[PDB]
Amino acid sequence: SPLLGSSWGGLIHLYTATARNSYHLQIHKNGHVDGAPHQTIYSALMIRSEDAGFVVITGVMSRRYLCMDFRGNIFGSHYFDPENCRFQHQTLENGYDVYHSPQYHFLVSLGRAKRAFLPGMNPPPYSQFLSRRNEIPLIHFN
Numbered sequence: 001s002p003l004l005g006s007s008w009g010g011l012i013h014l015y016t017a018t019a020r021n022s023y024h025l026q027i028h029k030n031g032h033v034d035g036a037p038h039q040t041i042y043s044a045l046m047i048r049s050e051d052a053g054f055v056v057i058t059g060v061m062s063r064r065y066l067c068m069d070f071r072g073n074i075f076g077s078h079y080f081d082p083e084n085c086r087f088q089h090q091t092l093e094n095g096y097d098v099y100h101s102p103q104y105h106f107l108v109s110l111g112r113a114k115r116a117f118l119p120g121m122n123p124p125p126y127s128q129f130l131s132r133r134n135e136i137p138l139i140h141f142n
């Protein structure tokens with residue numbers, strides 16, 4: 001499905017390129033967040049950039065904001081809460097990206113192992129992301 005620059009929707013799929021098992025972050029209609037081996041309409045995200053490297057991420061099809069609780073668990077919420085739904089984004093020296101809670105420090109990741117982004121150490125491979133341009137034709141979104 002060859003798409004033009006004016007037909008991919010500006011949507012991005014976050015892929016755990018360096019993890020042992022790589023997936024695209026998926027936000028389901030019910031708010032559950034997991035991984036999809038290949039791009040799906042539910043892994044298509046709108047990543048809104050703000051100042052100072054902060055971002056607000058929304059799953060286009062689920063209509064939910066990516067949020068995180070105090071334990072680092074991520075989920076999709078229909079309601080935006082600044083204490084849980086805004087992340088600090090940053091590109092590491094190795095070229096991959098990480099997203100972490102400015103209040104809880106935990107890194108966004110797909111599995112049960114939650115790790116805090118702390119100064120003086122490197123984040124684990126499973127928490128590193130690569131932004132992949134959406135390749136799913138827009139007719140599939142709704």
Ligand SMILES: O=S(=O)(O)OC[C@H]1O[C@@](COS(=O)(=O)O)(O[C@H]2O[C@H](COS(=O)(=O)O)[C@@H](OS(=O)(=O)O)[C@H](OS(=O)(=O)O)[C@H]2OS(=O)(=O)O)[C@@H](OS(=O)(=O)O)[C@@H]1OS(=O)(=O)O
Nearest residue numbers: 016018019020021022109110111112113114124125126127
């Ligand atoms: O926190 S831990 O130190 O215990 O590590 C857990 C995370 O380790 C990974 C790899 O991390 S990475 O190196 O940064 O990429 O892999 C480990 O767990 C997976 C998933 O296990 S699970 O029980 O099904 O959930 C194992 O993969 S698999 O064999 O099940 O397919 C890994 O085994 S293997 O090396 O692939 O053979 C296992 O590695 S190890 O034994 O700890 O060395 C992350 O999983 S990953 O994201 O799928 O790559 C783990 O993250 S997780 O949140 O725990 O799932």
